[PDB]
Amino acid sequence: SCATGPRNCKDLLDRGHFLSGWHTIYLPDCRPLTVLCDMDTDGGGWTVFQRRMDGSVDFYRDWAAYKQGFGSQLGEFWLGNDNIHALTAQGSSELRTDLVDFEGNHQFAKYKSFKVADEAEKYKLVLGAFVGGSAGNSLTGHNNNFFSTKDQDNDVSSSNCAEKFQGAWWYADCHASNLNGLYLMGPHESYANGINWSAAKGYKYSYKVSEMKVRPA
Numbered sequence: 102s103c104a105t106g107p108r109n110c111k112d113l114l115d116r117g118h119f120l121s122g123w124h125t126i127y128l129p130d131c132r133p134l135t136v137l138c139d140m141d142t143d144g145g146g147w148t149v150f151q152r153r154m155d156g157s158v159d160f161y162r163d164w165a166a167y168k169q170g171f172g173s174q175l176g177e178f179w180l181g182n183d184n185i186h187a188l189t190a191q192g193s194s195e196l197r198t199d200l201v202d203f204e205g206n207h208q209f210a211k212y213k214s215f216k217v218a219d220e221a222e223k224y225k226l227v228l229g230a231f232v233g234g235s236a237g238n239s240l241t242g243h244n245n246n247f248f249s250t251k252d253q254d255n256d257v258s259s260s261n262c263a264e265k266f267q268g269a270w271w272y273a274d275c276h277a278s279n280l281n282g283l284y285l286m287g288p289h290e291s292y293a294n295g296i297n298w299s300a301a302k303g304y305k306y307s308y309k310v311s312e313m314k315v316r317p318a
């Protein structure tokens with residue numbers, strides 16, 4: 102039940118669940134949700150809300166799709182903006198971004214706090230201090246920006262960044278990171294429309310694996 106159940110993946114780690122996988126947790130309003138726990142990376146206990154690996158799932162989707170979530174437990178997914186708000190409402194959550202290139206190199210970025218607001222505030226990004234990591238810092242530039250999709254433009258550009266750049270993100274004018282962009286498979290000639298993290302591999306290289314995840318601070 103909600104009374105005795107886990108709130109997040111750290112609670113599950115503490116209860117002796119040591120392998121990564123899908124588990125039921127209870128949101129602050131006691132609604133049950135099935136989530137992916139990363140128990141292996143950097144001490145474990147992370148709740149994963151985005152995962153790319155192979156380009157099998159189309160990420161160029163509308164407001165509705167990003168609001169509710171889409172994809173597969175067996176592969177690539179976005180957990181859903183309503184879900185991500187709920188998960189980050191209580192206490193304080195640290196953010197980790199894990200990346201792998203096609204040459205086999207693993208890179209990461211960590212932030213000391215992370216929250217997204219409710220739909221009334223367009224799922225606005227509230228981001229704390231950059232801690233470090235081999236991937237460098239390409240998200241601070243997005244702090245305090247609304248979320249935008251192709252059919253709903255909340256960015257700070259006279260243009261439509263989500264359409265430019267073929268993704269969905271807390272776009273500014275327009276981005277330093279674009280992890281929901283096209284699965285372009287390494288180097289690409291088109292500018293800034295792939296799975297890009299500009300502080301590491303720049304605007305013309307699309308990563309093999311991307312993963313975004315949270316843990317109580």
Ligand SMILES: CC(=O)N[C@@H]1[C@@H](O)[C@@H](O)[C@@H](CO)O[C@@H]1O
Pocket residue numbers: 274275276277293
């Ligand atoms: C993709 C994106 O937004 N790229 C911009 C680019 O268009 C230009 O404005 C530059 C100037 O500092 O800053 C970024 O690299």
Ligand SMILES: [Ca+2]
Pocket residue numbers: 254255256257258259260261262
């Ligand atoms: Ca705009």
